[PDB]
Design a protein around this nucleic acid. Structure first.
Ligand SMILES: [Mg+2]
Ligand SMILES: [Mg+2]
Ligand SMILES: [Mg+2]
Ligand SMILES: [Mg+2]
Ligand SMILES: [Mg+2]
Ligand SMILES: [Mg+2]
Ligand SMILES: [Mg+2]
Ligand SMILES: [Mg+2]
Ligand SMILES: [Mg+2]
Ligand SMILES: [Mg+2]
Ligand SMILES: [Mg+2]
Ligand SMILES: [Mg+2]
Ligand SMILES: [Mg+2]
Ligand SMILES: [Mg+2]
Ligand SMILES: [Mg+2]
Ligand SMILES: [Mg+2]
Ligand SMILES: [Mg+2]
Ligand SMILES: [Mg+2]
Ligand SMILES: [Mg+2]
Ligand SMILES: [Mg+2]
Ligand SMILES: [Mg+2]
Ligand SMILES: [Mg+2]
Ligand SMILES: [Mg+2]
Ligand SMILES: [Mg+2]
Ligand SMILES: [Mg+2]
Ligand SMILES: [Mg+2]
Ligand SMILES: [Mg+2]
Ligand SMILES: [Mg+2]
Ligand SMILES: [Mg+2]
Ligand SMILES: [Mg+2]
Ligand SMILES: [Mg+2]
Ligand SMILES: [Mg+2]
Ligand SMILES: [Mg+2]
Ligand SMILES: [Mg+2]
Ligand SMILES: [Mg+2]
Ligand SMILES: [Mg+2]
Ligand SMILES: [Mg+2]
Ligand SMILES: [Mg+2]
Ligand SMILES: [Mg+2]
Ligand SMILES: [Mg+2]
Ligand SMILES: [Mg+2]
Ligand SMILES: [Mg+2]
Ligand SMILES: [Mg+2]
Ligand SMILES: [Mg+2]
Ligand SMILES: [Mg+2]
Ligand SMILES: [Mg+2]
Ligand SMILES: [Mg+2]
Ligand SMILES: [Mg+2]
Ligand SMILES: [Mg+2]
Ligand SMILES: [Mg+2]
Ligand SMILES: [Mg+2]
Ligand SMILES: [Mg+2]
Ligand SMILES: [Mg+2]
Ligand SMILES: [Mg+2]
Ligand SMILES: [Mg+2]
Ligand SMILES: [Mg+2]
Ligand SMILES: [Mg+2]
Ligand SMILES: [Mg+2]
Ligand SMILES: [Mg+2]
Ligand SMILES: [Mg+2]
Ligand SMILES: [Mg+2]
Ligand SMILES: [Mg+2]
Ligand SMILES: [Mg+2]
Ligand SMILES: [Mg+2]
Ligand SMILES: [Mg+2]
Lengths: 46, 94, 271, 27
RNA sequence: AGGACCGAACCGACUAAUGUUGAAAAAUUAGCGGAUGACUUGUGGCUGGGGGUGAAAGGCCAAUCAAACCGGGAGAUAGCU
RNA sequence: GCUCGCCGGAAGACCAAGGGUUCCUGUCCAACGUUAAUCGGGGCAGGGUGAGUCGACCCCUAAGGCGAGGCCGAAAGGCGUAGUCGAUGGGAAACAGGUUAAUAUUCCUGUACUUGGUGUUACUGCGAAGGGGGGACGGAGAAGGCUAUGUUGGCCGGGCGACGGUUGUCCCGGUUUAAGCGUGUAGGCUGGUUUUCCAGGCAAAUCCGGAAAAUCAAGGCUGAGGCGUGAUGACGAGGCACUACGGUGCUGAAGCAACAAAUGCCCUGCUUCCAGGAAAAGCCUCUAAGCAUCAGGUAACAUCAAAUCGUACCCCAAACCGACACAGGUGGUCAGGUAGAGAAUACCAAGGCGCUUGAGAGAACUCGGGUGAAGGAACUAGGCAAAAUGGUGCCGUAACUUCGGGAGAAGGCACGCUGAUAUGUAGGUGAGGUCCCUCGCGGAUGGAGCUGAAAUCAGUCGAAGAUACCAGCUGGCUGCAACUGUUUAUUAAAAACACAGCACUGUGCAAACACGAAAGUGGACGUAUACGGUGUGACGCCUGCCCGGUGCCGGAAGGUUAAU
């Protein structure tokens, strides 16, 4: 069957990437939460 | 003119290999491990100065580092850059 | 010419074409074209504001002179063309100075006629002159509401506007709807009815012919659920309620005009 | 592996079960 | 010419049998419908939760929908077990 | 290694996306692998991806995003101008052969090409953020010309047959060659040329557009393929030698023709239709300020540069999405033979596999199939399922009908092989030859050779000639819905939805309406033959009575009635 994850790096980075997070206010709050939790991989972005 | 200090930091090591020995004896081409940011012109100037030998052309490629496991801990080796330096005919190098 | 199609297939059984052989069988005049990107009935928020719009054949925009400002200069009619953006046929005209334009084609207009705008224009079909220069009782189209703004009234295929009166600065019009409206007497108007009068005589025959025109299907409200529409619901076919919009506004009879700015310009409403 | 056990529990219940297998409303 | 005909690709899913701790969290086999059109498909884009979208089944919105998911109010409340 | 079997419009080959070293070599077998494992996509070590021409980057823009200022908004923030991003689309250029354990249009050999530079030499109007042209565009259909490619013949090399026969009308194999450059063909489009003038192209313009007048009908543009060169080359069956038996080296024949022929090319064409079919840059050209013999321009030649990143490997799959080495899903490209209408189907080639537990036995029972006496739906909720029909050509075909259909109605006959007509026909192709010519990729004539249906007559074989695969069961009555379509991803495909059509009603444009605290946006770059909503649902005949109730519309004399 066709499953729900059909990957595309371009769409992955445009949707969930670093600059998409840094663009908006709420996306910047996400990176503050992940730095506070101490995430190694802060985003998708390689 | 590329500065001599950069030309001294461009070349890292010669790469020994069966393909390198073949290219050295047939096409008169040496195979070098170079600095990663080094371009072809920087390489041609370095070989033409530090080895005093005439370079015809330089072909480059980037070597991706392998993923290894020391014990059970994962790790990744560094990406490095490789240059096929074609010498002119008659020129010789150790 | 309306042409009833022979029923070689359902979908051609009920088709009536409107064939006009005088239209140019070629590409339109390229400088007067521009891109017309479709919308889907969606605004800058992306939401659907007006329903049932979507799809259809790609359409290039034809720049049409409604302002009709080339005064004094006569113009001959080069050829008639099809406009997908509108119901009326358009006419490619050539001025003396070498300018080509598209106008709305009037009824009796054909290739080779001369038109001329301006005050000193004659009174024949095609000419454009202010309605203080136009005689009372004549049929005009492409009528401005404000001077120099451009024609906004009577642009559709077979329409016309009668001029019933004039009191100084204003003329009184009999619109195609039956409404009597005051317009300033300096506004330009174009003589004659608009061309393709038998446009409404066409029959699309099939659903695809509406999808070609970008008309997505209309779900009637009682075939829904009550969360979707006020009419929705029922165990069977039940409609025990007054007919409303999807937003709960009465449709059969309730008026919606709320402009107190333009009420002085309205002599009588339509009946 | 109790992490491969995490899979086990996390989604051998998220498989969700299909359902009762007797078309019977005891109605 | 055709929302024309028969019929592969392709799209779909009418029937039966299998399977039902499956090969498979909806499939296989044998048949079935459309198959130049209101077709189908690739890539990218837009619409956000009482909101979208909907040829309208309360359908779909990441194996979740008569109001998604995550976090928080929060140790909700529970005359019930 | 010899056999056998399977795919073969794929179970072969090339990629994109995606993965990210799974590639190759050596070594190991604890774990992984549904068994063993000496093997492996497993562990360990090493190696491996070479570009001016491929792709990206880059120049250009689409939908759309962001958005200086700006407008709006409790704040956050929303929209959006100039702009700037954004491919899935536009934009310069390379081919053949060889080679590695693993890369190659990247290396090597050979032969090319493109754009920028600087620099001389000749020539001299250069110049844009501007104007114009071009780029630049739909569906369907019809052929014609070709090629890829294939077949046969010829040619060359080899062979003379494990069992009767096989020096021949015999068997096998091979018969390849590119980009580029030159030629400008079939064919398609187009009237050229000169001068004068001009309310237009924001100003200008020699450009475009438009007016005139004269002369010439014949110039121009595009254009597959062919031919020549590239190529005295390369490749080449085979041989000759060494042989780590893996290989490496040397040498090397023929290398033609006819026919058939694409869904590929001419073709972004032609014809036709209506539903009326991107943008911008590169490119060409025009001038503006400016520059005035400087700058710059094109013309030749020379020289230099063309960076950086990707390139391994899988890619319909054991490497991607499915928790699995999962019978699932996944876009593009290539498209051999025989039969066949065919990319169906059957058998095969190239090539790739035999699906990671086997060995036996040959009970019940289950699964998937085969055949079946007599009967033939008596089974059953119900002919569920099976069985049956099945092709081409010809004859023939009812009620009804919206005159299109129904209809492939139904029903039926023929069908192989051989020979003759005709040692292979009609037809197709079309040579030599001869003639003509404003001479060539020319025009006639000519018919060699090749290819090649179909039909009739006669004969003959079998139980059976559409012999396999493939491939409609048919008809009668009736309900509903006009139809094609759509729908409950995962128990409902339907009489449900939609539909064309009909009617009511609103709406005069800053439209109604809708999304939005708003600005604004859609409607719509539309203007009542238009748009929105509601109901009905082709067509045909029709659509009757009731306004008391509830709504809506209109009224404004009176009663009542808010803030104030
Ligand atoms: Mg090179
Ligand atoms: Mg590279
Ligand atoms: Mg509508
Ligand atoms: Mg409707
Ligand atoms: Mg409807
Ligand atoms: Mg319903
Ligand atoms: Mg309600
Ligand atoms: Mg009822
Ligand atoms: Mg009732
Ligand atoms: Mg059809
Ligand atoms: Mg099937
Ligand atoms: Mg069909
Ligand atoms: Mg319901
Ligand atoms: Mg779901
Ligand atoms: Mg909710
Ligand atoms: Mg709720
Ligand atoms: Mg609390
Ligand atoms: Mg609790
Ligand atoms: Mg073997
Ligand atoms: Mg086989
Ligand atoms: Mg590994
Ligand atoms: Mg391997
Ligand atoms: Mg190994
Ligand atoms: Mg062992
Ligand atoms: Mg084992
Ligand atoms: Mg390995
Ligand atoms: Mg570019
Ligand atoms: Mg934009
Ligand atoms: Mg913005
Ligand atoms: Mg601002
Ligand atoms: Mg850009
Ligand atoms: Mg692209
Ligand atoms: Mg390889
Ligand atoms: Mg331009
Ligand atoms: Mg097209
Ligand atoms: Mg050929
Ligand atoms: Mg023999
Ligand atoms: Mg013998
Ligand atoms: Mg032979
Ligand atoms: Mg050539
Ligand atoms: Mg490769
Ligand atoms: Mg494969
Ligand atoms: Mg397996
Ligand atoms: Mg699989
Ligand atoms: Mg075949
Ligand atoms: Mg097949
Ligand atoms: Mg048995
Ligand atoms: Mg049987
Ligand atoms: Mg029997
Ligand atoms: Mg019997
Ligand atoms: Mg019984
Ligand atoms: Mg019975
Ligand atoms: Mg049956
Ligand atoms: Mg059967
Ligand atoms: Mg009944
Ligand atoms: Mg129906
Ligand atoms: Mg479906
Ligand atoms: Mg659907
Ligand atoms: Mg279902
Ligand atoms: Mg179903
Ligand atoms: Mg507006
Ligand atoms: Mg109905
Ligand atoms: Mg009635
Ligand atoms: Mg009443
Ligand atoms: Mg009232």
């Amino acid at each position: 069957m066709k499953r729900t994850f059909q990957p595309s790096v371009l769409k992955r980075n445009r949707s969930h990437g670093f600059r998409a997070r840094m663009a908006t206010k709420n996306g910047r709050q996400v990176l503050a939460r992940r730095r506070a939790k101490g995430r190694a991989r802060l985003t998708v972005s390689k | 003119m590329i500065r001599e200090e950069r030309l001294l930091k461009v070349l890292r090591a010669p790469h020994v290999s069966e393909k390198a020995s073949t290219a050295m004896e047939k096409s008169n081409t040496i195979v070098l491990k170079v600095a990663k940011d080094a371009t072809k012109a920087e390489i041609k100037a370095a070989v033409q100065k530090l080895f005093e030998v005439e370079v015809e052309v330089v072909n480059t490629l980037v070597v991706k580092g392998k993923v290894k496991r020391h014990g059970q801990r994962i790790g990744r080796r560094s990406d490095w850059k490789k240059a096929y330096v074609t010498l002119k005919e008659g020129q010789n190098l150790d | 010419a309306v042409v009833k199609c022979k029923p070689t297939s359902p979908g051609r059984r009920h088709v009536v074409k409107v064939v006009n052989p005088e239209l140019h069988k070629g590409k339109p005049f390229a400088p007067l074209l521009e891109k017309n990107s479709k919308s889907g009935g969606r605004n800058n928020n992306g939401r659907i504001t007006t329903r049932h719009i979507g799809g259809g054949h790609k359409q290039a925009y034809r720049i049409v002179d409604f302002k009709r400002n080339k005064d004094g200069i006569p113009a001959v009619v080069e050829r008639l063309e099809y406009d997908p953006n509108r119901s009326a046929n358009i006419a490619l005209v050539l001025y003396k100075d070498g300018e080509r334009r598209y106008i709305l084609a009037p009824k009796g207009l054909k290739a080779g006629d001369q038109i001329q705008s301006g005050v000193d224009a004659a009174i024949k079909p095609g000419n454009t002159l202010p309605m203080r220069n136009i005689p009372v009782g004549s049929t005009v189209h492409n009528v401005e509401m404000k001077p120099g703004k451009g024609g906004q009234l009577a642009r559709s295929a077979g329409t016309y506007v009668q001029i019933v009166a004039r009191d100084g600065a204003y003329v009184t019009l009999r619109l195609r709807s039956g409404e009597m409206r005051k317009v300033e007497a300096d506004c330009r108007a174009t003589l004659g009815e608009v061309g393709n009068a038998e446009h409404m005589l066409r029959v699309l025959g099939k659903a695809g012919a509406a999808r070609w025109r970008g008309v997505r299907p209309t779900v009637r409200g009682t075939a829904m659920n009550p969360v979707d529409h006020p009419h929705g619901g029922g165990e069977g076919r039940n409609f025990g309620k007054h007919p409303v919009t999807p937003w709960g506004v009465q449709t059969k009879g309730k008026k919606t005009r709320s402009n107190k700015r333009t009420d002085k310009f309205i002599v009588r409403r339509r009946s | 592996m109790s992490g491969k056990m995490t899979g086990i529990v996390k989604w051998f219940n998220a498989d969700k079960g299909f359902g009762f297998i007797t078309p019977d409303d005891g109605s």
